[PDB]
Design a protein around this ligand. Sequence first.
Ligand code: SAM
Ligand code: SAM
Ligand code: SF4
Ligand code: SF4
Lengths: 294, 316
Amino acid sequence: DLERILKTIKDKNCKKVGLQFPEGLKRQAINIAREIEEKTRANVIISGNPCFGACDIDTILAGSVDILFHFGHAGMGEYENVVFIEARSNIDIIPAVLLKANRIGLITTVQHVHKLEEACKVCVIGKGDPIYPGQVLGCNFTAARVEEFIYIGSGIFHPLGVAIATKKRVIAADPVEVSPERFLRKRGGYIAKATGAKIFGIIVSTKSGQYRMKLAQKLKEIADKHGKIGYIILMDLVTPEQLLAFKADAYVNTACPRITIDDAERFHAPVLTPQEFEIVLGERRWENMEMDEM
Amino acid sequence: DLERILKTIKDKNCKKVGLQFPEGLKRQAINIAREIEEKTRANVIISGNPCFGACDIDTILAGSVDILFHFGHAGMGEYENVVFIEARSNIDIIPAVKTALNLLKANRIGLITTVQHVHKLEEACKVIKEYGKECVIGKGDPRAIYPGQVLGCNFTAARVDCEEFIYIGSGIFHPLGVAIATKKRVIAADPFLNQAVEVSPERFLRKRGGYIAKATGAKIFGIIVSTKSGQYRMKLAQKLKEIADKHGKIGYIILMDLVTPEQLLAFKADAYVNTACPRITIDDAERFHAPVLTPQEFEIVLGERRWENMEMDEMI
Ligand SMILES: C[S@@+](CC[C@H](N)C(=O)[O-])C[C@H]1O[C@@H](n2cnc3c(N)ncnc32)[C@H](O)[C@@H]1O
Ligand SMILES: C[S@@+](CC[C@H](N)C(=O)[O-])C[C@H]1O[C@@H](n2cnc3c(N)ncnc32)[C@H](O)[C@@H]1O
Ligand code: SF4
Ligand code: SF4
């Protein structure tokens, strides 16, 4: 893709250029900056912060350069001077493509979204929202709002999320039939532990696509409506170290919902999704359990 | 303390209040928020990021609240709605001063300290003069507000006419910097242990000499800039990138908030130049996986500064 970047800089005669990478790709940062500074007149600034997705735009860097190039993710939101360099996986998914139903849904991650159209020939792909048909995220299952499901990729969080959010069967094909019962007992365990919690830290992230302050204020009032207390804690990164310093009984995460699931055993008090918080408080019934979405 | 905060909230009729603590005081955050929300009508938001000092204001939070209370440090900069609740310690420092008087060899003495003892420096100065000596307290600047106050990144209070210094406080980084910055003898007097020692910059400079040597064969540098409110040095970084190119090397500017070993390891640079908090360079040296240099040590490595022309990295 490096030639589109060079052409975009020259054609826009960019003078200052920002680069932002997911963790998996910062190993390439210095080489890409080298190519740009050698083959253009632009000066490069690399973002040095962790970056977890298109929900995590370095907007400070973006407001300092003519164009910020953000790698590894499909776009999100609308910032005038951020270009998303997608970076797709070249692997073949047709080997991976147990079913029972006649209408079968395709869902995947951004790295394979270009390959759905022909996996479909081998069926209705689900259109998303503000990106691609069939794309799901840890925080967004719109593409699954379309009888059974085949997910394409690695990891089990995405198929689980689809299975919980639509209550349909999902086959997970890496390039496995997904059981959400193991995940729901787990989340049940955290709800039980937090049932006797009296004081809650309500986590809000300033990251560009993870900020949910209005929901946090709602959650604070719902806690007080039920004779408990939540204090809003505003931060950038959400980490077990930073939550240990505040002496709360339990936490409610309104930032990235995969923090809540992935890094669960790593936190030293219970960390809850908004919806599990409501169940702990008595505002929502356990049967009305849903995936945290943004 | 808490009475000042409550009064300020009621005098200024605040509805949204922010709290920011250094790491040692986040343990009190919830208790202080509770007190505020029970005794006022205000809603509290607590900053959850690391906070390293008054150089590290949570300006996103401050731009979201009527007033941000920032704890533990003396003020710095000029932020319209930030109130600094400083960390003042009540330990008697005069016994440490007396111990340090044993060690002096000159009659004209400078006094410096950290923020938690600046209110007692005038009393120390009186005792030192009562014991036959001349004594002076240097004025700070817009960064080190109080007379006699030094920071890891600011030794202006030490730029005074005196023969030797007494530093009052714990740790040895501050008197080391004063010793290196002034070329004068420094006695470090710790009021909590009541001991005085003569600081020696030799082990310090031998250590810094070791990192310059490792970075001397470096071809590619990451030049680190922090977006923190009082640590941002982009113009300097742009200068150092040009200076590297002038000398047949390459520096790439890397803009970040926290500067940590994990973040520096993700980039394939041979070495780094840190224009953020100078104490990162010193304290965390052994933890980084490539050499990290001060701006001035960078100039040595490149050929812009004699290797003995060694100065402390200061924020100014
Ligand atoms: C690795 S990304 C997942 C990839 C992709 N974003 C997706 O939609 O599935 C999710 C991980 O990023 C990290 N993460 C996301 N937002 C974070 C935040 N605000 N603070 C700290 N870690 C965060 C968490 O460790 C979480 O497990
Ligand atoms: C302990 S505080 C210093 C307290 C006081 N401000 C002073 O003048 O001495 C300095 C430490 O904070 C950490 N620190 C400061 N700024 C930082 C930054 N931008 N990123 C990561 N760590 C930082 C470094 O580890 C450094 O050792
Ligand atoms: S799952 Fe988390 S990291 Fe991925 S897009 Fe959603 S908020 Fe960002
Ligand atoms: S030494 Fe570092 S942490 Fe202390 S005031 Fe200076 S920049 Fe901030």
